Amino acid sequence: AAKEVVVVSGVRTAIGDFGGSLKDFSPTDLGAKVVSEVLSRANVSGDAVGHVVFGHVVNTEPKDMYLARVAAINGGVAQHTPALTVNRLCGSGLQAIVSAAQTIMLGDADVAIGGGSENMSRAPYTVPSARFGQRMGDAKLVDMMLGALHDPFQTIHMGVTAENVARKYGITRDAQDALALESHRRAARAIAEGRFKDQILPISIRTKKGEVAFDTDEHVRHDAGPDDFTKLKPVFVKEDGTVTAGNASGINDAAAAVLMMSADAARAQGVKPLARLVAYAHAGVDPAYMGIGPVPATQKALERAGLKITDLDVIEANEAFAAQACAVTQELGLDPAKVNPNGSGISLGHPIGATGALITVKALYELKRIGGRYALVTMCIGGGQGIAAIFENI
Amino acid sequence: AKEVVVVSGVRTAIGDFGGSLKDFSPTDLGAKVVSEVLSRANVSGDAVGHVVFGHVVNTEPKDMYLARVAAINGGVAQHTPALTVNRLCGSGLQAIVSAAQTIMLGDADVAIGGGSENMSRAPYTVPSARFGQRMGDAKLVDMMLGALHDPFQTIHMGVTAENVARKYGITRDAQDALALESHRRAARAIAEGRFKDQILPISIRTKKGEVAFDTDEHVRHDAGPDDFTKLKPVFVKEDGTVTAGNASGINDAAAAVLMMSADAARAQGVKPLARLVAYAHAGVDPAYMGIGPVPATQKALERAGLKITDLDVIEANEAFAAQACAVTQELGLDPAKVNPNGSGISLGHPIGATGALITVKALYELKRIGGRYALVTMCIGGGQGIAAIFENI
Amino acid sequence: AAKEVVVVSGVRTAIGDFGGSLKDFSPTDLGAKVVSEVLSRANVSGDAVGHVVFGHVVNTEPKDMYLARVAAINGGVAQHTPALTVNRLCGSGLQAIVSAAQTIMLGDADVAIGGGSENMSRAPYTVPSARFGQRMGDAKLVDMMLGALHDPFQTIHMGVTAENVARKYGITRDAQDALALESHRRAARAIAEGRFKDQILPISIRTKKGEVAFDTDEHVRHDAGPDDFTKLKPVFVKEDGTVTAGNASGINDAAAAVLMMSADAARAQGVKPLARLVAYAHAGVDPAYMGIGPVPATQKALERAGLKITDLDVIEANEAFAAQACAVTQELGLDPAKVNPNGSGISLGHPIGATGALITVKALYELKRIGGRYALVTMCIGGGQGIAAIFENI
């Protein structure tokens, strides 16, 4: 059978705004930071790591094609450790955790780090005609960030697929704005109560007035009210729109990681862990409706775990767009009070390749906060996919 | 862990930098080999549990969706998950491993593993373009050359090949020797038609009409030892040995294999090419990445319960003659069994697709000689190696 | 002999900061604005113009290679009028006036417009390898703005030549900072007293809060004191520097123009003009000391006019760098009280191709303000030149 996977430690950066506090930190710099910190939290030597896997979508510089290896080596992991970068779009961060967990399940490693790192502020433009020349006529610089946010089959923004989902599943503008407002209020309450303090790694952000610690998610609106969202206009369609800048997730910068071990290695070391991995699942859907990806992925994961929706104490289902996040909660029959109890992509931001790892960290720390047992982590995936994993607080 | 069988495989011919495939995007090449492996195995596009593609250098936004685009446009149903993986030059074998693991773990009965890379279309980036440079000249960054630079010392992969040449005693004469033979083995393979069955031809619409690209165009068919010893070292100015002639080329290509669980294969009447025996990974000093295959291979043989002398076929990619010689040397391999039909130096090195492409070669060579065991291994920029062993069945 | 040239009207925009209030206004848009306004001030039909000449240095878009013609046609000048763009670097704006005056002197036109337009905020980057490709290796985007500010023989910033002049002519840091502070105080006094109101054309700058009129030079520091300049560090040399961001001219955006006529056409029409052109002169100097260009150019112009330094009531000598502006005043024996009485490039900005026309407008309006008789307009020129003209209030 497959070895049991224990999540012993986890950490995330605070999430930076587009062009904001982390704009000068490369994806490999952020990844190295969370690698070194998870090792310290788990009391694991950098020489004792069997595998490193990082999720990451938008290469910002040549180093990023080496992202997992640079994050590992600069995070203090020995050079004998293999390192893999994976890309499943917005599912990449949770995919990294699954792929790292798989090396343990299969006996290839007793210790593995899975994380994600993304700096969208530093996403580049390309010049396709630069290598061999354009000769004559105007050419383009291609926005690789916006390009990543376009479905590659119809060349429509993710936000257009969110309208497709809104229309198909009956998710009104008012429903979307209610979810968005509530996400910000939940995030502001979590910040005010200190719910995120233990799971965040502060970053010193060298300012001209001296160094200051960036340790709070800066996308959150702390005094938001209903009229802030009603006044906004739809951003992705010219007719009959519902998706706005306020009820869509942000574009953001962050990194996060967990350190996992075989259950036997965790017993022998005597660690006091966060959780164990119960099950995971993948699904594919119509690309034009990629936002409901989490529905089949969650149903499959629950089947593998032998659990039911009502067994879930904590659900982190990323708010890519209120339009799809509502449809997911509705189609699954989830209690909105248990779903994203401290906010999600709309209020905290959506650093795409890191999101899936960062919301895993959130989920496991929330289980500890409430003494809960099972958490579900799931998210939708551009191109038409879903990914889901279930963890047990132990 | 379920048993994993390869039922089909295919590759494109390997295009030169700026050559016959320069107009074919990585997702275009990927979809072509996906469709072809399904039809070779006679497997419905609706029956695929997972698709994994290796790929390193994004040439356009669609490339961040590469596996999904290759799968959908290759005829795989939208309900199949798709993953792109990047372990640099090991990415193509990694995709096959990652796809096999979905089968081993019971997540899927059928999985496609492949790789796709178009280095000709590798882009230049402008890191200052989004928020501006404000004042002062700015950089147009060669993402292809940057992929070929170690990220810790910012030296070309070829500088690490020189390091490996010094440490292990690989001479210039030795490097040019392997390079010449590789070209001679490749030219012989092409003449005898050894690659015919494993290559998917591609129509490369020319002004002269509609021609088929089905031959690896990097090969020098008239090569003589003088051709290599005249060239000059290109990566270190003095006391150097790696040249353009004894180093792999920059190339474009795609390849894939389709795998199934043993049970699912039985239950479909599909004559499997081979079976997966074992795989392994290794990390090494980045400055000496070219020696990564040695520990990875040793670790793979250990897991397989096999010895070097049990290998009838070895596909060990020739990133640099300086590195490939030291691999063969440190492992104790018979050079007649290693890359018997050429490799990176002669056939080219389409980095993200290479590991999948030489897996296809290794398996077709096993069938050609009636062998049992084949080893596939390659080095990895940044300091790693990857290796896999297959059994002809 | 040569016909006498009357300056009947003139106008300038307010000067915008780098990245500031005029950043969205192209050079041909600004030029068209001042063309239409000078025609209106002089009561001259757009169908009665014999020639248009504009100074302009840094092309921002393809239209700018047609700059004079676009400014003329869009400013309401008939299509039968010839239009010429000239480039003598920072002397271009006054060169345009001289070249336009020359068509009148030679009997080619009885009416001619001379102006300058520059938007440095919109200066582009080029990609030299884009047309035919780079093939392999990194390339560069070339800053055409900074490039224009580099001497083309030694590839040193204009600011390095300013240090050369400071050293050769004994212009201390304290002397440079005294000039800079005084320039801002003079500009702030002129603004507070309304000295510039009649010569500036307001521009409506479409903001999100509604339209607002940009009519005040925004580079001026109104509460400047000596310590603001002493604290700054030298910007152009690593050793023994004196030139700073505070005592160097700014990078700026603006346009300006005058309308001239033959004296006979001015008599017949009965215009009430600003001034007449008395003389002009050019000079070349060592490129490494281009900042003293105005000295020989001024001496030559005075000789042609049969005037002496002491006959000058108003001097507009552009403050490119305090280092050279001091050396010019010192070598010529000018009274600093008469030189740039209302500020200059350090305080108001230096929109290079427009500066020479804009400070001509300043000079002629200042003559009217004080009832003076003769004004000198002069400036230094990258590559090692000077240009000067003398005008008489009539």
Place this chain on the structure above:
Amino acid sequence: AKEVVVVSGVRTAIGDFGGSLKDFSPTDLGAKVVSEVLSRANVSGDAVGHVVFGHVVNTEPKDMYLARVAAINGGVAQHTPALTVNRLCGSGLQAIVSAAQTIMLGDADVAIGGGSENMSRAPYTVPSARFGQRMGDAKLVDMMLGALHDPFQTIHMGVTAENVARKYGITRDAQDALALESHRRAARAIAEGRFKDQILPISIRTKKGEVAFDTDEHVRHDAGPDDFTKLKPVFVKEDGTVTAGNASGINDAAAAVLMMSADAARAQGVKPLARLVAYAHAGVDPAYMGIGPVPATQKALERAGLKITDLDVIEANEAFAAQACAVTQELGLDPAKVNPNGSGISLGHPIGATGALITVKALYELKRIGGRYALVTMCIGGGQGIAAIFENI
């Protein structure tokens, strides 16, 4: 207004787009013709009162200093003022006019007027690069093609040539006729060596050694009427006539003339080529800019007190056959006296240098036929024309 004499002149051979001069910057070419005109006239670099160069498309930062760089690196003293002027395709004749005016007004006794343009090196710009694009694709702007677009309707100069073809009745057969003859006149001139004395050879360092570029390489020496009537219209899709064959090329070159006051020439013993008789400017409808030469020429003849039949040589640049035919037609010129040795269609159109270059041709042709009066005129994008008349002396 003092009398202005031309004592010397020179031009480069005209390079094709991407051809033999592609590696020579505009300031490099400018300095070469500056040095050569000084030495041809035997005039000290210290004796020059003014330098003016026409030039349209900045290829690099130094180009904004073009006249000054051409003058200094061409041996002119640093005390000489230097001006760059831009009247689009008239810039090269404008520079000669502007330089002559400094002499006419007594500001100078000696002045150089020239032009320099390297369209091959014309750049792409990124208007968003300084302050950033933030989000969304951005433009890489072709500054060369943009220079060839009218700024009011954003149509190619060739679209205005079609407008001119309709208004004045210039047929396709008529255009291809002029194009063929131009090429035949140019090929004859080159064969007979007519351009030998006016061309400054340039060494264009090749891998085959050190070769001299001294022949206008746009010329088709084997041209036959079938070559032009087979080509298709390129600027309007339907009901079109201007083709790649009957339109001028995109080209690189430089040229200059040195002028002095009559007195200063006498006082130096310098045998002057010719004398400036008159010049004139005209504005026209931008949509019909190609007809600008007609009023400019009429206005120049009026000032000169001459008639069309007094002109022994006419250099009227062939921007487009459609436009040049209408110019000759509306002025009533003998086509045997107009561009007797080819022009823009056959020799090329290095825009900023053209007006200076064809002035050199016109003067050398006057000496070759013993003529008296020569006319130099050309059209101007945006709707202008410029014309000058010289007297052989």
